[PDB]
Amino acid sequence: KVYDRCELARALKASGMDGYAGNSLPNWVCLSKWESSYNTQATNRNTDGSTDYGIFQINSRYWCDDGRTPGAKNVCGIRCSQLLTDDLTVAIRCAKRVVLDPNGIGAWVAWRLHCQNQDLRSYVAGCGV
C-alpha cells in the first residue's frame, strides 16, 4: 500500500508512535517519506547482502529474517516479508524495538539526513492530529 501522508500520520498516532522513546510524530512521518515514499512494499538491496524492507526500510542484517542475509540476527523475530503488508502492525512493533537501541532514531539514515534538526511541522500540517 502507498499511504497518504495524513493517513499514515493517523495510523502512527493511533499506534502510540507519538512520543515513543521521546520521538514526536513528525519525526516518524519525515523518516517514512524519505525512506520509502510511504510505500509499504518498498525494498532496497545493499552492497553487503542485506535488504531494507517496508515503509521504515528496516534492514535484514539485524532486525528480520529474509533467508539470504549473511550474518543476520533477527532481533524483531520476524520474517522480513511481514514488513511489506498494507497493515502496519508488525512494522510498527519492529520500529518500536529498533528505536530502543542506543542509537535511537539515528538508526535510520534518511532521518539523520533529511529530518534531524529540521522544522518538521509540515509533515503533519493539515492532518488534524
Ligand X SMILES: CC(=O)N[C@@H]1[C@@H](O)[C@H](O[C@@H]2O[C@H](CO)[C@@H](O[C@@H]3O[C@H](CO)[C@@H](O[C@@H]4O[C@H](CO)[C@@H](O)[C@H](O)[C@H]4NC(C)=O)[C@H](O)[C@H]3NC(C)=O)[C@H](O)[C@H]2NC(C)=O)[C@@H](CO)O[C@@H]1O
Catalytic positions, please? 35, 52
Q: Is 37 in the site for ligand X (CB under 6 A)?
A: no
Total number of residues shown for the chain: 129
- Compute the least distance from the CB of residue 26 to ligand X, in Å: 18
- In three-state form (DSSP H/G/I as H, E/B as E, the rest C), the secondary structure along 2-36 is ECCHHHHHHHHHHCCCCCECCECHHHHHHHHHHHH
Distance between CA atoms of residues 39 and 118, nearest Å: 23
> Cell for 32?
517514512
The binding track of 55-74 with respect to ligand X, each residue x by CB under 6 A or -, is: --xxx-xxx---------x-
- Compute the least distance from the CB of residue 73 to ligand X, in Å: 6
Q: What part of residues 5-24 is at the interface with ligand X (CB under 6 A)? A: none
Identify the residue among 24, 37, 46, 122 touching ligand X (CB under 6 A): 46
